[PDB]
Amino acid sequence: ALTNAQILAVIDSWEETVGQFPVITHHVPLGGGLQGTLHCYEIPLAAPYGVGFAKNGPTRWQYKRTINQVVHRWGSHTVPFLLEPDNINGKTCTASHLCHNTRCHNPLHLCWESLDDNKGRNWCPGPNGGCVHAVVCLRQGPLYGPGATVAGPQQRGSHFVV
Amino acid sequence: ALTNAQILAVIDSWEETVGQFPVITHHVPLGGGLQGTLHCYEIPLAAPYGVGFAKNGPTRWQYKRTINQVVHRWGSHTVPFLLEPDNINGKTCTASHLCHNTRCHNPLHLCWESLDDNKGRNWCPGPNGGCVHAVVCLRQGPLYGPGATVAGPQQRGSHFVV
DNA sequence: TTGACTCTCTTAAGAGAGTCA
DNA sequence: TTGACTCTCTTAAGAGAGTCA
Ligand SMILES: [Mn+2]
Ligand SMILES: [Mn+2]
Ligand SMILES: [Zn+2]
Ligand SMILES: [Zn+2]
Ligand SMILES: [Zn+2]
Ligand SMILES: [Zn+2]
């Protein structure tokens, strides 16, 4: 098995490569009518992506390193968390984009949490709009708002009460 | 089926049958430290479910009627909305449980909205905790809260900024 | 050892359609 | 005509593993 030192070396090589990705400045809603700035380190749209990186899906990538003749591979956003527990409350931990930008690999924009917690950030009012996430959101979720409901609750007769 | 009269007849027969499902009272969080009461009309756990109803999945059912000698079938929660547009902004409209209770077929607990709007209600603070859904929530979403994040944003080196 | 592709899978909110009696 | 089963599919947040040079 890879030692702690070997895992730290994988995290360090990943950070060194991602740190050279193009850094894109994005202005974002924070909630409460305020605007903030996030700096995303974005993997390229097409090959080559960077040393160790390869695309396994339209918005999916993996990081690969060969150590003592053995090939090791990880989901490209999971590398910052290789020294962390990989499950919690019986649920698998997932890399969760606080910036809601899949191509971003900035580890300061990632957290490590259940898929439900991950998804829920899409609708969060944001750090200045009432976020209650213990690991605070960096921005209002892209899907926050009144929604676009086509039809609400209704009945034709009198068979039901709420 | 095709005619508005036929569609209204389907909705009316569906409402009559669902109106005879057992009414189960559920006390629910509203947000803001308040609690409310919902009356769900719950499809039975096992056959027979009611005239026109059949189970296609552990928590999935379909309603079927024979019109003009042809069988017409719908997802069991979609029937109240048969006169509504079936898409919005190019997204499929879905039956969305305001009570977060799949077996419930009370149309006063259903709305018709994109799958994203639908999902997002799981994390809503609720009608007394800050819900901004234009078609208002009936309860705080079951997944609202601080979450259980295992690890937050972090870097080992000095290559990244937020 | 490395790059650039290939494939299928998970989850939890939701769907459509066929086989028998 | 009605009932009671069977199967796979959609979406958008996420995954693992194979092939070839
Ligand atoms: Mn996410
Ligand atoms: Mn729902
Ligand atoms: Zn980012
Ligand atoms: Zn938040
Ligand atoms: Zn209900
Ligand atoms: Zn709401």
Summarize the helices and strands and which ones pair or pack.
The structure is a homodimer of 162-residue chains.
Chain A: H1 4-18, E1 23-31, E2 34-41, E3 53-57, E4 60-67, E5 70-75, E6 87-88, E7 91-97, E8 110-114, H2 115-120
The structure holds manganese (II) ion (MN) (2 copies) and zinc ion (4 copies).
Chain A binds a DNA duplex (21 and 21 nucleotides) through residues 47-49, 51-57, 59-60, 62, 64-66, 69, 71, 73-75, 77-78, 92, 94-97, 102, 115-116, 118-119, 121-122.
Percent of residues in beta strands of chain A: 25-35%
Radius of gyration of chain A: 20 Å
SSE string of chain A: HEEEEEEEEH
Query: Distance N terminus to C terminus of chain A?
Result: 58 Å
Give the total of beta strands of chain A.
Answer: 8
PDB class: hydrolase
Keywords: Intron encoded homing endonuclease I-PpoI, hydrolase
Assembly: tetrameric
Entry title: Homing endonuclease I-PpoI-DNA complex:reaction at pH6.0 (K+ MES) with 500 uM Mn2+ for 120s
